[PDB]
RNA sequence: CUGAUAACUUCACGGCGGGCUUGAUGUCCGCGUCUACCUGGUGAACUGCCGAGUAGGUAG
């Protein structure tokens, strides 16, 4: 909305605390159907709270501001709340070099994320690796198109409307010690034709 | 341009009654620590005088 050439290209996730719990999400009255005001159906949610630090690979190679680069954040991540502090306004710079990238973050009792490249044929394979380690994580890294897709008339922001399902992944500990290339971080998308599976730019 | 957009789980509360861990016991025998060692103040802050004075004062 200011400089139309930021153009991010990558991202890295460094996850520092994980608590996942289950705490109700009170929905809010709506007109029923027969004539009253009531509640909709109840259900069982599960919420989280990641504190976790961000660091991304843009072409941009000049310094971005102090001011703006504050109001420019979004407010939401997965229907949560995203703040940082005011303090802690003073350790956002930019950087030419990853290796004093990763010395700029004031906490130092986090983990790395990458991929787990190998073969999940059933659910059987998954748990016999997770009662190996009992470290690691599953998660949606991609969806899976149904579709060609087509031009469907109140498709949201009018664009063009498939139908996906769900892609399990397997996620993994990353120390960063002196070896360990960037290309198992910074991750991106790209687009295989039936399916837009995350991964990182080492595959 | 985030399984997208919005979202109050709340009110009340007496865990209580009673209680014997006991009896008995041999840690002992032997034993070589030793040899050898430089701490270095040149002359340097000297001589009277009063007072009975190991006290006290006083001169250049």
Same mark, same amino acid.
């Given at each position: 909305? %200011?400089?139309?050439?930021?153009?991010?290209? *990558?991202?890295?996730?460094?996850?520092?605390? &994980?608590?996942?719990?289950?705490?109700? $999400? %009170?929905?809010?009255?709506?007109?029923?159907? /027969?004539? %009253?005001?009531?509640?909709? !159906?109840?259900r069982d /949610?599960?919420?989280? /709270?990641?504190?976790? *630090? &961000?660091? $991304?690979?843009?072409?941009?190679?000049?310094?971005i501001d102090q001011d703006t680069?504050? %109001?420019? &954040?979004?407010?939401?991540?997965?229907?949560?709340? !995203?703040?940082?502090?005011? =303090? /802690?306004?003073?350790?956002?710079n930019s950087f030419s070099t990853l290796e004093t990238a990763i010395e700029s973050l004031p906490i130092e009792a986090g983990r790395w994320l990458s991929l787990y490249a190998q073969s999940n044929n059933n659910l059987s394979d998954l748990l016999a690796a997770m009662t190996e380690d009992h470290q690691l994580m599953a998660s949606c890294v991609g969806y899976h198109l149904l579709?060609?897709?087509? =031009?469907?008339?109140? *498709? $949201?922001?009018?664009?063009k409307? !498939?139908? !996906?399902?769900?892609?399990?992944?397997?996620?993994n500990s990353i120390t960063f *010690?002196?070896?360990? =290339?960037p290309n198992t971080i910074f991750w991106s998308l790209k687009n295989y034709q039936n399916y837009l599976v995350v991964q990182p730019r080492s595959i």
């Open positions: 909305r %200011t400089t139309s050439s930021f153009r991010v290209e *990558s991202f890295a996730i460094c996850v520092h605390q &994980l608590h996942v719990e289950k705490r109700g $999400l %009170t929905a809010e009255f709506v007109e029923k159907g /027969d004539g %009253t005001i009531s509640a909709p !159906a109840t /949610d599960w919420q989280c /709270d990641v504190v976790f *630090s &961000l660091i $991304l690979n843009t072409n941009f190679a000049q310094h680069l504050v %109001t420019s &954040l979004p407010k939401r991540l997965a229907r949560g709340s !995203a703040k940082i502090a005011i =303090d /802690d306004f003073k350790h956002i579709e060609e897709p087509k =031009d469907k008339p109140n *498709s $949201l922001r009018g664009y409307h !498939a139908i !996906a399902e769900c892609i399990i992944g397997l996620i *010690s002196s070896e360990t =290339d």
